[PDB]
Design a binder for this molecule. Structure first.
Ligand SMILES: NS(=O)(=O)c1c(F)c(F)c(S(=O)(=O)CCO)c(NC2CCCCCCC2)c1F
Ligand SMILES: [Zn+2]
Length: 257
């Protein structure tokens, strides 16, 4: 029943999910001047060569591309992480206009959108179980700015007209998420939470410093999606971002100087 609107959006979520007011909620503003360079952090290992995309779905909040995560096929390790995290899905958050849409901010700057690649720690066996653990998930966050097109995104944007309204899905195989990554894997990292209900405090966030560029046409297709189900009043799926939450005692670490 939650969403992003005036009566059911982020300021209301604490009533159903009191963890919304917890000590490690996400997203956050990344103050780049107070982030601590940690020379002991590892390079992030992203191993997406054998990834198997399966389907794309409009769930009424975002859209999400789900992967075969029953094998060790698309894994994140290294960086701040201990052990192996398997990719289960990615999704995006975006704005009604180019000056907003990201969840994280950088020195208060909002990006047009943010891509989240969600991974779960294999020591917990399954994504639901992992979501109940303090080190259960690792989410790789990538900012999107509007400028030149990202050719690797086009396969995603071109099927969005088939999943316009809540509950629609389609097969979506052979999508390579490597085509969504920027050149650099320099990153900030901090302990946080899911940014949607149930808001569990189970995420190690890894947010890349380098944005990708996407074109105005690509992001316009995101904005044609609908929050509503077919046959309810039309509400365009825009501004599906949670604003920055208090950092509380946490340190953000940088992998770079
Ligand atoms: N931003 S985020 O990465 O914290 C996020 C979402 F915004 C999001 F919408 C989803 S969702 O569509 O699946 C809706 C429920 O929050 C997940 N998904 C993860 C969290 C759900 C629990 C199971 C663990 C892996 C999926 C999710 F991780
Ligand atoms: Zn997200």
């Amino acid at each position: 029943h939650w969403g992003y609107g005036k009566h059911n959006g982020p300021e209301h979520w604490h009533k159903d999910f009191p963890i919304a007011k917890g000590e490690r909620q996400s997203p956050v503003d990344i103050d780049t001047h107070t982030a601590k360079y940690d020379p002991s952090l590892k390079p992030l290992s992203v191993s997406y060569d054998q990834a198997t995309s399966l389907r794309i779905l409009n769930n009424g909040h975002s859209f999400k591309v789900e992967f075969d995560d029953s094998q060790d096929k698309a894994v994140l390790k290294g960086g701040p992480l201990d052990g192996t995290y398997r990719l289960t899905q990615f999704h995006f958050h975006w704005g009604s206009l180019d000056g907003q849409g990201s969840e994280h901010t950088v020195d208060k700057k909002k990006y047009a959108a943010e891509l989240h690649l969600v991974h779960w720690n294999t020591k917990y066996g399954d994504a639901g179980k992992a979501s109940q653990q303090p080190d259960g998930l690792a989410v790789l966050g990538i900012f999107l700015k509007v400028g030149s097109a990202k050719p690797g995104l086009q396969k995603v944007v071109d099927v969005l007209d088939s999943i316009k309204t809540k509950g629609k899905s389609a097969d979506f195989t052979n999508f390579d998420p490597r085509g969504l990554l920027p050149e650099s894997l320099d990153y900030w990292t901090y302990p946080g939470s899911l940014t949607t209900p149930p808001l569990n405090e189970c995420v190690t966030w890894i947010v890349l410093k380098e944005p990708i560029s996407v074109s105005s046409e690509q992001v316009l297709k995101f904005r044609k999606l609908n929050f509503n189900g077919e046959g309810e009043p039309e509400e365009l799926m825009v501004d599906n971002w949670r604003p920055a939450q208090p950092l509380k005692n946490r340190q953000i670490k940088a992998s770079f100087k």
